[model samples]
Structures are given as structure tokens and as C-alpha cells.
Target: KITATPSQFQPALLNASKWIWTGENPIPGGSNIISTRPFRKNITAPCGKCSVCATIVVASDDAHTFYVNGVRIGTGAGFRQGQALFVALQPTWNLFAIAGQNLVANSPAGIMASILVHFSDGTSETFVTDESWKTLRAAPPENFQLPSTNDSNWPSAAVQGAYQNSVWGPPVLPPVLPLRGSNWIWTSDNVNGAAPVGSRAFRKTVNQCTKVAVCATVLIAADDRYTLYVNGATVGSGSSYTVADAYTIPNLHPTFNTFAINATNGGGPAGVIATILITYSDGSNETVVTDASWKAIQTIPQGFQPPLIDEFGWESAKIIGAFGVAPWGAGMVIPSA
Candidate 1:
């Protein structure tokens, strides 16, 4: 099972008081909210025997800092729209907080921030609000977050890479996942419908073709019907496409790896899906499920929907997996010579 961050949501902004460090609007005229603590004096928690990671997506115009149990874990300075950070669980009681500074006051055009905490028990706790710190409290100890490894069949992937054609129009790139170096592949073919407006799918194949190792783990959003296959083998499968029933892949590593997605469309237009992100054994990454590297594997020619194919919708892409170090850093290595 896996839990994903809320769909492209804006942070909850509130007016700041003391709990806030900078003493400004929690959202600062922006669509999302900011944190209300100093560098290392906010929340605190005990670390359990598990792994934990976070995703903080800031709009193109944003800057912020993150802390865990009073310790500086990660920071985003010259942040982009989808800037994100992943850290270790530490196993002790911990506190997670974000600090955002208003580069331009009164513009109402600041940044949107989101936080996702993935636990080791296969459950995730996600929070996407802009409420002021004075009113917000730390998450309880029992409320640990978790992440999964699941991809969707026709699931909505992030628009983190470059795409073309008609899978969707004006493609979208979720902040959770970003295009690092590799490429992603996707398609909008409704395996069970007609023409353009049918279902959608995204695919990404990483050709590490290197001596080092690499692996990809996916956590799909619920409310979608999907099937995932890695190198022609079904690793994860699910039908209850809801926030509670996410699909997670165990560990997939191959010199020539291939990921496929097939989603059955049912909800209305406002319905967005999950995302995919890949981490190479050697530290290379790419955002999957978008037009980035995905293409129309197949689709109806002319009849029910649009005659021409379009690439502008969402599929499955975003989120990272376990990272190993040195011969054991933060990721797994592919088997090779």
C-alpha cells in the first residue's frame, strides 16, 4: 500500500503572529502558506525503526528551509516551482517545519508549498494547507507517514519533463517529481475507449547502460483504475484508486528497464492522478508519467473523439525510493559487469 501527496493543491495561508518567524502573512499574498519557526527551533519527534522522507513543492517564485526535530535536514534557496527534498527517518521523535521568506511583498504571487511524510509501515500522512503556525500544531507521534512503490495504468503522471502531441493540452508538471537528467515516456491511449478523450497512460524507460546500478519505486494516487508492468512483469496492481489504496513497486532494477501504465478514465475533468519519479543507482533521476518521454503507443484513428492525438493531460509520475550510500548510499545498484 502507498499514500500520495494531495493533488496539485495550494498551501493554506494565514496571517502571521509570533509562532511565525518573519512576521508576515503566512502565505504572503501567494497561493500557498509558509512555516512559522526559526532555522532549528520548531517541532520535535522521536525516531522509530523506519524510513521517512518529505516532498515540498514550491512554485517557480519561492524560497524556504526545512528542519527535523530541531536539526537542519534540508533547505531550498534558489527554489524552482517544484523544488523537493528527501531525508532519512532518523528513528527518533522528530519535528518537521518549513520557513518561507517573502522576496516580493504584497504581490499575491509567492509560492505553494506541500509536505508528505512517508513511513516504513507502508502508510503515508500528507498535509497541504496554508494555515498560520500559531493555529497549527505538530503531528502526533502515532501519525507517522509512509510511501509506496506503485504505478498506474492510465494513471496521471507529472508534467516534469518535455512532452509533445495530444495526450493533453498545456501539459502539467507536478512539483513532487522533477526532470533531473534522464527522460520519461507516456501515452494517452484509453485501452478500453475511443479517440482522444478516453483514458490516459504514461511510460518511462531508463537506459542506464552504465556500470553502476539504478532502481525505481512508484507510489500511485487512489481514485484511479491502473495496472503497472516493469520489464514486462507486473510488479504492482490495484483497482481501488483512492488515497488509501495506492500501488507501490518493490524494487525494480534492470540494465534496460521499462515501466508501463494503463488507467481507466471515469471521474470528471477536475480529477487528477498520481506521479512517478525514478532514481538511478548512480544518482541520476527523471520524472515519469508526463509527455516528457511518453508517446502514444496506440489510439483510435477517427470516430468518437478528436481525430488528431493531443498530449496535455496527467498520467502517473513523481516520488523517490530508498537511497543507499557508497556500496550502500541512498539507492540500489543494478546488476551489471
Candidate 2:
């Protein structure tokens, strides 16, 4: 599988892109159902043969429901803001729709929504609410969600607020991780009464002879947190210890390559586990599982270098235990959300 860069993924409401916040009508004083505006936009896919996926971020004064190509995708309620929704997209022209409600006729009522579309070719497009989108003040049409529905009669949505002026303020994009795996937590120490609480470093090296392109992905999980570095450069970091985070290294040296993890346990148990999957361009693949061979150190190195090769005075990481299942899966997948 191919990996996408962080820039290719962003919230739909970005000021740099000149996307304005919008709503169906002006907010009236007090709390009341003043408007339920349905907004719609049409976008043509950039690629003709690639599959598309979208990550949508939305927020409303009272609540909002979302639909795409006539299918219900998600709903944000209770004056929710900065809510994220993920959806698969059609290959060609696609209809993106939203039904935003101002249940509370409050002074500041509006909706902020943004979508990032990821194409199969590693490119991405961002769509946000702006005046160009069509909006209707009344209930949405029965077929409003359908892509074929004609929205020529619908009026353009008015600009309700800008990036930082909206009722919900600035829109926030959720964190994105490209890979998934199971969590591994360790709790034992070699020479301590209790496992150390500060930072710890782990290292492993792989020497390959293949000149072809290599796709190296590592699945990592730590008790509190961890940062991953490959061949002396930072690649990615783990977000949650309860779930596994996957990091992909696109560029790999043909010879000795170093893989390092800087992990920490805040105040409780401390441990980390990781596994690497290497796929060579020739189709042969290899798996590197975290085991006793990996070495650890109490302090992090000042720069990127092979721990053992450089003789940085490191110790073996304590292998207290392992888990069959993590609280959350290794990577992003469909959940109730």
C-alpha cells in the first residue's frame, strides 16, 4: 500500500484556501428553531481511474446531519463542533451535502464544515463551505442528497462567519494515521525496583542488499507515548498507547538502516513493542518483530545514529509482557463513529 503525506490531509475549513464559513440564514435573538438549511456542492474527481476517500470535519451551533450522493453519512448533535466524519467517495462527479440546524435561535448560529479528498495517486483536494455552495432555507428536498438532483433553483449560502469569527471559532482537524496494528505494553525493568518513568530509547538495524525500492512499515505502541525515527530522521509518532500506531518509511538505504523508538511512561507502567514489515520491489518481503534482540537506553540520543553500532551505552528493554488485543486497533478503520 502507498502512504500519503500529512499535507495531503487537512480539514475542510482552512483559511489558507480562502474557504468561508456559511449558514442558511442570519441568526435570530434567543433560542428557537429559526432555520434548517441544506447546503450542497458538486465536485469532479481529479483522477478518472482512482478510488477516492474523504475525511470531513463539521461543527454547528445546534446540530447537523451529513449526506453524500444521497446516503446518510453522519450527524453532529448538541452544539457539536470540530466533529470528524470519514466517508468513501464516488469516482466521478460527486455531490456533498449537509443539513445544518439552528435549533437554538441564539445570536450566533452557523456551521463550519471541511472535507479532504484523498485520491488513489497520493494527491488530495480540499473542499470547504463557501458562497459558491447552494443552500435552501427550508427543509431539504426528498432527493436533495442524490447526485442527479438539480440545485439550480437553490440560493447560494450566505457567509455566516470567517475562520476565527464563527460561533465554534476556528475549525479543528482530527489527527490522521495511515497504518494500523495491535497495542503492545511492557511493564518490567532489568535493574529497577519499579519500571522507570522517564524517557527510554530502543533501536534495531536492518541490512538489505536489494537495490529495488523498499516499502518499510512499522507497527508501534507504547505505554504513554513514543516517537519513531528511521535512518537518523524522524518519521512519525504514536498518538495513543491504548492503540497501535503505524509509521511508513518511504525512503530506505540499501545497506545498514537504523530504526529507533523514543518512548516514555508518564507515571505508571512503562513499555513499548513494535514490528516492522519490509516489502522489496521484487515481491520478496520480510518481517522484523520486536523481541529480546532489541536494546534500550534510559536517555535519548542527541542525534540519529544506530544505538548499538555507535555504542551509545544502551541496555536491553525489559519485556514485562504482551497483549493479544489493544484497546483500539492498530490503525484507522470504521467504527461506530
Candidate 3:
């Protein structure tokens, strides 16, 4: 199951999304037609666990209905209006369906949407309308919205215009919602019916506190999502590309402490940003982030921690962004959980 907390989705003003229709931009405005535009989020769960946070922002020419993972969320107010909805993804496969209708032909035709998926493990995925979304002229058979339904029969969607198309004008986007990297999609002749489409762990070894260590405070946030570990013991995790997760470690090892993080993304490039405020009983303190000088890998075997874990091609972690960089803004903290 998945849950979506309300968020302010103001997209950056410079970005635009693709708008789509059934092969034609205007599609002959003097007619009423209903179409089912179905798409899927091609994400897989790890280790058989599947809990994700997803938010979808959508709009259509006349009227449209939204469904997530086969369950109806709501009906659109209008093409000029946008709405936000949540989804429950399957452990293996998931589907998103939009049944849209254009009013009595005097109006334009099309739909546009954007989706963001966040994992508790601290990764995020983005979904937008594109040629991969399939289109069916009319609402299809029973259970068509099911993720398990047979969608191979559907044709690919066509790229009718952009989300900010002059023909349709800019969609009335929901306040505080940003589609980020998504597009408008529908079916075309070649695409008209159907279309198709489609992490790292790092650790650092710390010196055995020369003096007894009291407690440590950690602040973390990723471009998408993240998980924090101390000496391979699960400490805490967080969601979203922004904000921060704060946690406390009541005890520290006298020998050496290993700080490990596994940060990932929905597909876009991602990097984890974190800091540890270490306090020592000897009236001293130190600060270190999961940045430069840390090691990363394409694989992590069991018992993969710092202080000398068997090396399997562990390369140096690339420093991609800083605290105030583009996406990794100065993070905010919440009440302790």
C-alpha cells in the first residue's frame, strides 16, 4: 500500500510538460468523445516489500476521471483545472488510468499530467504523459484499469502539444505542485492506441572515540529518498527530495563506528546529502557528512559496513551537490519521531 501526504506542488516556472491527444492537436473541436488513456509506472520493489509515496497532478481538455492502481481517485473539474491524487502500487506491477471526455465538440481535446513517486528507502521516480501512454477511443471493457489487465492491445499515445500549449493554453496547475520532468501523452495512429515504456550504498569508518562518546545527532535529506544505518543497524529513513530527517544515537562504539547510507532514485540522477554532529564525553565534538572521501558501489553483500568490510570494487563516492545546491536546499527538520 501507499500513502500521499498533501504537499505544496509549485513547479518551477521555466519547466513545461508535454500535452497529448488522439493523433491530432485539435482533433476536430465540433464533437464529443470519450477516451481512455492508460499508463503504467514501471517500478519494482526490492526484497518483496512495496510501500511507496506517489502524487499525481492532472488536467484534461473537457473532463477526465483519474484512477491509480485500478482504484478511482476522482473526476477532473475541467481542462483548465488541475487536481492532485494518491495511488496504491502493487508489489510488482502498477497502472494509472485516465478516462477523458471532450465536451460537445466546440472545445479542444487532450489531457496532461505529471506524477512523482517517493520511496521510504529515500528514492524518487517521476511519471509524465508521453508517447508510452496507450489510448482507447472509448472507455474499455470491465477491469481495464487493473494493473493486471492486458494492455498489450492498446496503441501508443501521440504527442499533441505541450503542457503549456497555446492551443490549450497553460493548464491551470494545482498550486504548490510541480510536475518536474513529465509530459502530456495520449494515443496516436502509430501511438493512438498504445505506447510502451519503462541506488547506492556508502559507508565511512570512524576512529574509536579516543574519549568516551556521549550521543550523536544526524541530519539527512536526499535528492529523492534515503535510509541511514549505524554499524549496519537500522537507525532511520526518510522520503522526498527535499526537507530533512533528524535522528539521535544514544550510544557509540568505543572502537569504531560505521555510518552507512543507501540512497536511490526513481530514475533521474541522485545523490545523498547528510551530516553527523558527533559529541564526545571528553568535552569535544566533530562533524562529518556522507560526502567526499566516502566509498560507493554497484553492489552490497550482507554485512557490508565500514571498518574493513570485504572490498568488492568499492569506488570513491562522487560529490555531486552541496547543501544549498539546486535541489538540495538547506534542509528543514520536523518534531522528533
Candidate 4:
């Protein structure tokens, strides 16, 4: 097994080379149903003759089905915006499309879709349209971390981290850790009252390395939640919070684990919650256990707050990717090999 940059293993989403949205057969004005165009292209990957994995970021706002080479890869519902579908591929010519369901294209011509690809070595790429799908290719966003509920940067009425008297959730505090001296960061949206309902949101970008993978282990300090996404692809999400920590994503094709964690915070004062952790399988174990180290490297905005320390216990991740009140726990990992 080897590790590479995300670009080496993934595909680039470009407007010029990506699919086009022809409004010829619009989804019907006001109706939710929409139509999509077909695509056939020959792209190249850094590593040849290797098993590859691909994910499509659909711009549709409703249920949509996808077919590769006429083979039904998968389907999704109420995708709205920023939804994804992943697929493991064989070495050969690959084809993809959106069929059946109506994608809400109101009073417009039509809508287009975007796609991102990942390979075994760890590199990945993407393709967005010139019009519809806005491509995100810059360093991660600032304010990516969840700013303090009471911070001057936050809106006063926003209520940074307030826990109400309700059975659904308990008072917000920092996440609890299994080991006393474990190096890690603590951040949650609960303080800001922005807990994950069904899925948690976070961001990451592969810079130096051509290959990378983002991984997270959701710790339900309170109740159960479902779904995690990296650049819009579901890494892992389920109702059972007791699952094994070594669980690998079924559809992920990266050789190593480089996770961008997004946990659901609900129910408890911390209520529904998910632990954000990361590890890279680049022939060795690479995990993010410190805000200082996470902040050392500049990629995207990471969520950092108190109690979320590293090997020596420090707080410094950007607020965009990690956040929470006390009693919160999470981790992150990037490729160093």
C-alpha cells in the first residue's frame, strides 16, 4: 500500500472539461422534476491499472439516479445542494449520467452536475460546470471553524453556546476523552446551537500530496446521529454510536486515511454529537491530535476551541471544520508520507 497527493488519486472538477446543462428539456417551470445531459470522456489518472473510486457531487435539488456505462451505480433523495454519490471503479472506459428523478430547475433552462474522483494511491480530482456548479479549489475557507457563541466576532443574538432546559439535549460542556493524556482538539456547534441534524458539515483540500483521505469517528457524547461528508461525500454515518473505531468506509477508495471530521450535535445539552477524528493509511498511522499541529499547516479553516488539545494539550484549529462546547471529542489526520 502507498500514499500520494489527493490530486494524483483524485480527478479535477473543471468547467471546460466537465458536463454541460442544456435547458432544452427543462424540469418544467415551478415543478421539482428536472432533466440532465449525458457524458462520455477519456481522462487520465496518475496511477494506471489500479482500482479507482469516483464520487459525483450532484447539483440537483431532488431525488436523482446515476448510471456509469449504463450500470446503475446508485441513487439519492432530496439532494438539494452539495450532495454526493461514491463508486469504486474497474480499469476501463467509465461513463456517468443522471436519470429518472426530476431535479428542481425553476423557470430556467436546465441544470448541470459536478464530479470528483479518487484513486487507490490517495490522490483525487473534480469537474464543475462553467455556469451552475461553483468549483471550490482554493485553500479551505476562513471562519471554517465554529466561532465562539459569545465571541465578539459572532452576532449577539446568535447565542454562542447556550443549553436550554429540555430533555432532547443537556447543558453544553466540553467532550469527554477516553484517555487522560491523549493529544486532541475540542470544538462543537452546540454552543452556537448549530448541531448536526442528519449530517455534520466540514471542509478539507489536498495541497502538497496528490492523494489524501479524510476520516472521522463520531463519538455520541449524547445521542445518536447519522452521516459525515468530505468535500460532500459520505465517509461514515449511522445511528449506532457503539460501532468499532477501525470501521472503513464502504465506498471510499483511498489507500490511506486523511479525514475531515463533521459530527452531529443534538439531543443532549450536547445532545446529538459526532466525534471528528482523522487518520492516514499511508503505510503507517497518521492522525491529527493537536490544534497547534493542525494550525501549523495552512489548507482550510479548522474548528478549534478550548479543551481540544494535542499531544501536549493546546487549542488552535480553525473554526470552520471543528467546534463545540466542553465535553466534546474529535480528531483529524493528513498524509505525511
Candidate 5:
């Protein structure tokens, strides 16, 4: 089975309110009411440079179109149809608008809807059909583009069923991975004969950061087993050759942060590969990967040492593998949740 470590970048599920109909709840498949209406909801983004991902489940007798920040995002067909959207949100209030139409003049007419939003900071906010949503029996005003626009004249949508209980069922959000990249397996035997079944150590250092945030994440793997350490402290370990392991470091000091790995071959050939993706508070990112720049030793060291000290005594690791298509392609994203 495929396994991945949980990460903060993963999308989260949010709790929404109930579905609100245009008018009183109408009987389904009994009587039909034909009409057109516009619905609107408002939300706020607490920070700049953040993204908003939303998945909406909605159903109407006829058709409907959805919009974000006044831009048309998607249109749905008959009952129970919905869409998912990703939009760059400003650092302030945002608006969600939907124009719903009913074609069945006799069949019961109503609409059910739910929405879940994932923010950049790994937090989530949810909105559903409820009295808090504004409903306009006629077309929405041309000025209804921004959240700052006046909408108090519109009436509240009528509550139909609580969220996840309507004819369309609950809203489902898309799955997100914590990390994205591929692994490049390397071995001490690449240049020469295969190293005897035993442990080999490797080291690399990262620079330029004065303070390390919690955003840096690493993935490691070896042919048999491996133990990883950062700044002299044990971070994590893995034993499988087919699957990679993940670790999230708490802090990476400025100037130089050491990453050391102890890889073992058990009884076969020896190999290792690892990668670290760091996201700073300012929205910048850095990636560190295993390559010839790393130093390796046939045996474990007295202690995990910085690259400056270890590089003087250790030999350069041999290049044994690389990332390409399929099994060697980019690494999988692991949700932190």
C-alpha cells in the first residue's frame, strides 16, 4: 500500500450550515414551481497572498452558474450537479454568487447546496444554504460584484435541510498532498563495487535562513533501512526500499542546517535518496535533494556532523538513480492532517 506523511499543505474539511431554498420547502417530484433566483454569500480572507479552494454540491430542477469574486467559474446541469474551483483571493472580503433557474413549471422546484473552502494557511471555512445567505427573486444587481456592495434589500434564503442531508447528499472536497516531487535513489556502489551489506552515512547542509519555520518537510528512503537526523537530533527512520518516509523539522537554524542519513543494505546492494522542501513565512520556497554534492562514509560517524566538518573526511556519494516517469517520477504529496 502507498503511505505518505501528513502535512500542513493538505486540504481540510469544513463544517457548513444547512441548505436554504428560495421559498418554503417544496415537495420533491410532487408539484413543480418554475422561477429564477440569485443567491449570494460573503467571506473574508485574513491574509494576503493566500489561495482559496472550494468544492460545491448543488442541485436545482433546471440549471445554475457559479461565480467567485464576480468571475463566472462554472455552470452545472440538472439536479444534483456541482463543481470544484480554485481561485486566488484578495486579502479582504470576497463574494460567492450563484444564479439558479427552474424549468419545471409543475414538478417540485427547489435548490440544495453546500460549499467548503480551504485557505492557504491550512485552515478552512465552510458555508451552506442558510438564512444568512441573501436571495433575490429577480436578477442580481449589476453592482453586486464585490462583497462591499449593498445586498441588505435581498431576503434571506429559506432553510430546507441541514448540510449533508439533502437529496444531493454531503459536499465532498478534493484530496490534497502534503508534498510533491520524485525520489532519486543513489548508492555507494554506483562508482565502484557494491559496498558490503552494512551501514553507510551521508550528509548535506542548507543555508540562507536566519530562522526556520515549521514549513520545511523531508522525504527519505533506502534499499533496506535508514535513520535520519537533523542538526544532530534524530528526526525519523524508515525500513522499506519500495516506500519513502517523511519528516517535518521544527526549526532550521540560519547559515547552515545539517542533514545526515544512515542507510543500510541488509544483504543486497546499497542505495539511498532524500529531499527536503522548505517554505518560508514570506512565501518563498527552497528544495534540497540528494546528489553528488553529498558526502558518504562506509560506516556510521562518531556523531552526525555538519557538512563542513564531515565533507573533509568523507567521500563524495556516487550517483545511482534519478527521477523520471512512473515509479521514479515526482514525490507524492502527504497530508499533515
Candidate 6:
């Protein structure tokens, strides 16, 4: 039951990692209240002399525990998948922790890691718990894990753009196989019947990429409205052109990354499809779909989220269909609204 995919780290050493939280914003019942949240990340283990090894992969949503210098080593219950433990390190100031739990008080939680450290000359070091780490909502004293325990002041975690693209979600089943490569974008005036209208914005960047358990999956759709954005923010939204909405955004950007989607077309029939794979911990991956080079714009340019933004001149998105075609034909998969 260890279930972690993205191939299974091959040469990973950190390039990108995300899924942080405790920034609030869960507005559900309105006055809801945040849940247990006490993250940490204070590594200084340069080398523990010839004997240093590490591998910690955690994924959380409904529950989590993980700790190191203070000892606990494991605990995770839902977020579908991701859980690992392997320890051996003491060099300097350690302390890696997490307490995050959220049954559903207002929903929306966070956590995800990849910590690999393997040294003895072969050299290794990696960490992926974006937002720098450190988070607390106020009540967290009990040594909190201990490493001296000041956590500076605590207040850095809170991004939530990866791991099925948050609301606390996604692990896999994201196949939805369509064109295996993707191609359906719009904004070339509005393909097909041309009923499309206003607000278009698409993009693409993908370079070097990074890696971690369940790195990238992404799937998109739009005909009426979709939001999706990454690296800059907002990684979820859908209106269903037929049915397609999957995500895992989590920040991305070890070297270069960008994903944008602002789809809108109150008139329908428009278009917007996406596909992506990414995965790299050495195990290799990087897919990206919705061909034609991707990059369009009909308007939309205030802040546009961030993926660099400028876009240069945008234009080049006109596929029409690819993957069963016809009107969105066989699309399936949904859960990123």
C-alpha cells in the first residue's frame, strides 16, 4: 500500500516541489476555522560523515504526522497516495516536521514532500515542500519537533498548486487518454462553428522541469469558462466543455515552467484542451499537450497570473480537435472545479 507514482524517483535531488498551506482562505461555511497546522523545515545536515541516507515522501490532506529530529517518522491517511519513510542523518540542525490535519471544517489543506538526502561523496540533497516551509497557526509548542524550535517566527507555507491541484486532492486515474499528446486549443478566431467569444488566454513554457512523487498530471477543458494557472497562482477551475478537469500544479519551476488558461466563451463551441505529464526524479517524463506550439491571447492581460506574463505577442493556437473530436466527444475525468 505504499503507492507513489511519477515512476519512482530515479536520480531525484530536488528541482521543484510544492503543496504548502495554512494561509487560510477556505471560505466554505463562511466562518469555518482553520485546522491543525504546524509545519517545519530546518535542515542543515551537510553531511553526517560517511553515513547519511534519507528518503521522506509524504502527502497529506485529511491527516499527517511526520517528524524527524523529534522522532515520529510516519503518519498520513488520505490524499489518495504518497507516503514513505527512511531515515539516517544527524549532521547539524535537523528537524523536519508537519502536523497538518483537516477533516473538513472548511476544507482545503496541504502537505507534500520529497526530501532525499544521500551522501558520502556521491553527493545528494533535495527538499520539496515549497513556500520555503515553516508554518503555524498559533498553537504549537511542545518542542514542535525541536531543533531549538524557534522556527524563526513561522509563516511561509501556503501555495497549494500541485497534487491534483488542491482543494486537498488528486493522486491518479488522471489518464483520460486523449490523443496521448493533446491538441484542441482555440483562439484562432474561434475554430469550427466559430461560436466562441471573448476572454481567451493560453500559454506554455515547460523547461527542465523538476520532480517529486506524482509531479504533473494536468488535464483541462473549456467552452464556457476555465481558470487554471500555475507558477503564478490559481490552479483550478472548470466549466466543462464536455468533461475534463484534472490538476497537480504545485508551483513547478525548477528551471522553467508556466501554464495558463483563462478560457471563456459564453457562446460555447470554443475550445481549450491540455495534457501534461512532467514527472522527473530521474525516472524521466515531460509531456505537455494541446499542440500547435500553444500560446494565444485575445485580451486578458492585467496580471494574467504569472508564467512570465508578457507573452511577447501571443498567437498560434488552432487545432480544432484531436482525441475523439466532434464536440468534445470522449473526454471524461473531472474534479478540479
The model with the greater lDDT, 1 or 6, is 6
lDDT of 4 by residue, 1-337 (tens): 3343222112222232222233233332233224433322333455463435554554333345555544555555432223434444543434444442344454222223455555556555564333322111122133221211112231111111111221112211112212222332323433453333433323232232544433322232222443434444444544443331222332323443333444444454323223333323221122233232332212223342211223233234433223333434333221110
Query: Each candidate's TM vs. the true structure?
Result: 0.36, 0.53, 0.44, 0.33, 0.49, 0.29
Residue pairs clashing, model 6:
161-249, 161-250, 162-248, 162-250
The prediction achieving the highest lDDT against the true structure is 6
Cα TM-score of candidate 4 = 0.33
Task: RMSD for all candidates, in order, please.
Answer: 17.7, 10.9, 19.8, 20.2, 9.5, 15.0
Candidate 1 lDDT, 1-337, residue by residue in tens? 1233222222221111011223233433222233322222222223542433443343322455554443444455432224454333333333444454435444322223344444544444444323232211221122121112111111111111111221111212232332233222224332232223345454556566762323343544322455555665555545552231223332344356665556544543211233455543222355454333443334322221221234344343322211211111222111110
lDDT of 2 by residue, 53-102 (tens): 56567767667788877777778864333675655566566788888776
Error of 1 at 135 (Å): 19
Candidate 5, run of 10 with poorest lDDT? 1-10
Instruction: Report lDDT per candidate.
Output: 0.35, 0.60, 0.56, 0.34, 0.58, 0.64
Query: Between 2 and 3, whose TM-score is larger?
Result: 2
RMSD of 2: 10.9
Quality of model 6 by C-alpha lDDT = 0.64
lDDT of 3: 0.56
Of 2 and 6, the candidate ahead on TM-score is 2
Residue 59 CA error for candidate 2 (Å)? 0.8
lDDT of 6 by residue, 216-270 (tens): 5576777777787766667678786766666543224456777778888888578
* Ranked candidates (lDDT, high to low): 6, 2, 5, 3, 1, 4
TM-score of 2: 0.53
> Residue 250 in candidate 4 has what lDDT?
26
lDDT tens digits, residue span 162-186, model 5: 5455554544432222223433444
